[PDB]
Copies of this chain bind each other. A is one copy, B any other.
């Protein structure tokens, strides 16, 4: 808990990048990552978003044609278990035609092992809520 926040920020950036990216070819890996790094409730929110029954699912919106990439802009550490991560999303095809370019906030609740004074170290997201800040196209 002098390096606790520096470590949490590495885990938080990684979680946002893995959760918010889209690549058809690595969907199974993405679901595995989220299931293991999240509570059941948080994972089910992700799965319900991704499910093809959601018309706004990236699987439906991007299919095999587009990738969505993510750039982390900043992190605000609220306390030991809450942070807000600001990030940009960019979606495009193999031609470089841009379907989305947006600025986002994720408000994240998390729990993480304490840092001591196989080397297991646990980090779990307990809450994850998105807010669109800006559509940098329109």
Contacts and interface: CB of A to CB of B under 8 A. Distances in A.
Contact of A6 (B25, B26, B120): B120
A115 B71 contact: no
A4 B114 CA distance: 13
B122 A1 contact: yes
Interface string A1-44: 11111110011001000000001011001000000000000000
Interface residues of A, number: 33
Interface in A86-103: 90, 92-96
Contacts of A96: 94
Contact of A121 (B5, B25, B119, B121): B5
A117 interface: yes
Contact of A116 (B10, B90, B117, B123): B117
Interface of A: 1-7, 10-11, 14, 23, 25-26, 29, 71, 77, 90, 92-96, 113-123
30 contacts: A1-B113, A1-B119, A1-B120, A2-B115, A3-B3, A3-B7, A3-B116, A3-B121, A4-B119, A5-B119, A6-B11, A6-B119, A6-B123, A7-B7, A7-B10, A7-B115, A10-B11, A10-B14, A10-B120, A23-B71, A25-B90, A26-B71, A29-B71, A77-B118, A92-B94, A93-B94, A94-B94, A115-B117, A116-B116, A117-B117
